[PDB]
Amino acid sequence: RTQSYTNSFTRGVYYPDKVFRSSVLHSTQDLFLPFFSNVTWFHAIHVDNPALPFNDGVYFASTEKSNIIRGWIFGTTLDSKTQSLLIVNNATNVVIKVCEFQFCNCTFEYVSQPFLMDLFKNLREFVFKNIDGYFKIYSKHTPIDLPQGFSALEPLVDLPIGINITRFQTLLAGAAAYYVGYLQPRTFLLKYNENGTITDAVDCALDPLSETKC
């Protein structure tokens, strides 16, 4: 398992809306990763318990350069009893499933380009949340542990599934390493540049200096 704790720093900022804004400071209230938090580091080695609770928002990271991580299974339980979410990606075209097959009602098969455009370090980053029946996907590829820089994640893929998720797991093809971060409701101030990309941000509930800035 090798459960380890590392500093999350400032690696949890994404675009909160699909609206272009240039050179303006906008303050939003949304589920977010707090700055300078702790994430959980796992060294999943198979010849370990992958049971991880949701807790209202999951921040996923992977520093693996090779395409060894395949997909994610979501839902409440995985026993072919209730509904469970079953993203499987065979590195050719991603397939989304709502069925609850054990170690393979919307039934939304989104067969298109995969979520893993990657072929330096090439860190990968994912943010998953579920507000009003909508499982969002934010993903970015940062060629660089967690670096000292910013990377705004974009809402590239949306899912109108509308199910309930409590327990999630990872999928492999044993040198798996991934970071799990949690999301809490917080207030941010986001700085847009002249090109419309987020370059600077500040948490409004971390420090009195930061609260004064907000």
């Binding site: 675009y15 809306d17 699909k18 609206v19 272009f20 804004r21 240039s22 303006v24 009893k81 209730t82 509904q83 009003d132 029946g133 974009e154 809402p155 590239l156 949306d158 109108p160 509308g162 309930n164 090109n195 419309g196």
Partner: protein, 370 residues
């Protein structure tokens, strides 16, 4: 403006000029299919309130005037949107849910309304921008012996949080004694059937209810109304109806770098500035066409009647057009008064070192000077 029949000597501010729009441009996405509202409304049976059926409607054209023909309902009462304005502007996704309830439970399917069905069977959000259609079905969903096909849930360990459905049935534990699948004294079955008879009152009759949940903003539109499109025009102050977002301004080519998931450009004052064309993927800047203040420069009515107009803060190489003399200032430009090289004291002020007067010329006119 001054509510007087005589005005004194001085400069006065009266009104504002505005370039009027010319034509009308409507841009809608290229969708030709027709939405299957008839399949939702003309169905043989409806599912229960605890197991309500959800239908996704997208990538078609919706006619909301045909709903009155399909069902003989009372009225189409809605929150945030009007019945009559559905066909003009248009939406992103349409959600249709249908289930059957009693007559007493019609009043509790609403935003911010709680009770039994709203706590255990079907809960609406507070910002719910959709509405319901309810009508009596005592001639179809009732039997003389009792229609026992429909169930509802009485007991739950928590309240309902919106747009969720419970499927699994478990025996409720109303006490410290565990149940383990046995319906004991403190253990009860979670489902009870509806007793539907034609001899009952109007408050307990069966009712077929259909809710239409609509989503606003983002997600480039897949369903829109029956209004036709119009060819695009640029560099003219015209009206525009872009995906139902109306306005008035100048459409022009833009160099902004939108992200592919982004479609709208917002100003500082929360106003749309850059827009994405729904037919072809191009980005257009929206700027309002020319306007500004209008100042009236005049002497007294007892002296004369001749009037010079000052166009405030606008270049009159593009003035919407009154004499023949034009002089340019920093504050704008002056129409109806000439310019002289003499230097006099300031009779009436304008700004940036420009003063006007009523003086002899041969023979009486309005002159401007430094």
């Amino acid at each position: 403006t001054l509510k007087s029949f005589t005005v004194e000597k001085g400069i006065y501010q009266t009104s504002n000029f505005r370039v009027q729009p010319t034509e009308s441009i409507v841009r809608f996405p290229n969708i030709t299919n027709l939405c299957p509202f008839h399949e939702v409304f003309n169905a043989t049976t409806f599912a229960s309130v605890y197991a309500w059926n959800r239908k996704r409607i997208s990538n078609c054209v919706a006619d909301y005037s045909v709903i009155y023909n399909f069902a003989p309902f009372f009225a189409f009462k809605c929150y945030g949107v009007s019945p009559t304005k559905l066909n003009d502007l248009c939406f992103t996704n349409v959600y249709a849910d249908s289930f059957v309830i009693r007559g007493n439970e019609v009043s509790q399917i609403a935003p911010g309304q709680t009770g039994n069905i709203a706590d255990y069977n079907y809960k609406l959000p507070d910002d719910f921008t959709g509405c319901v259609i309810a009508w009596n079905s005592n001639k179809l969903d009732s039997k003389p012996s009792g229609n026992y096909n429909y169930l509802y849930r009485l007991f739950r360990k928590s309240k309902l949080k919106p747009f969720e459905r419970d499927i699994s049935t478990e025996i409720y534990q109303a006490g410290n004694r565990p149940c383990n699948g046995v319906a004991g004294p403190n253990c009860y079955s979670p489902l009870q059937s509806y007793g539907f008879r034609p001899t009952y009152g109007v408050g307990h009759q069966p009712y077929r209810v259909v809710v239409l949940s609509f989503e606003l903003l983002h997600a480039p539109a897949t369903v829109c109304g029956p209004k036709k499109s119009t060819n695009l025009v640029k560099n003219k102050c015209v009206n525009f109806n872009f995906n139902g977002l109306t306005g008035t301004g100048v459409l022009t080519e833009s160099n902004k770098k939108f992200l592919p998931f982004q479609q709208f450009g917002r100003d500082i004052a929360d106003t749309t500035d850059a827009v994405r064309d729904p037919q072809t993927l191009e980005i257009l800047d929206i700027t309002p066409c020319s306007f500004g203040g209008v100042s009236v420069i005049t002497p007294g009515t007892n002296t004369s009647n001749q009037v010079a107009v000052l166009y405030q803060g606008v270049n009159c190489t593009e003035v919407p057009v009154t004499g023949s003399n034009v002089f340019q200032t920093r504050a704008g430009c002056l129409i109806g008064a000439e310019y002289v090289n003499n230097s006099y004291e300031c009779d009436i002020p304008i700004g940036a070192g420009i003063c006007a007067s009523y003086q002899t010329q041969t023979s009486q006119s309005i002159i401007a000077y430094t």
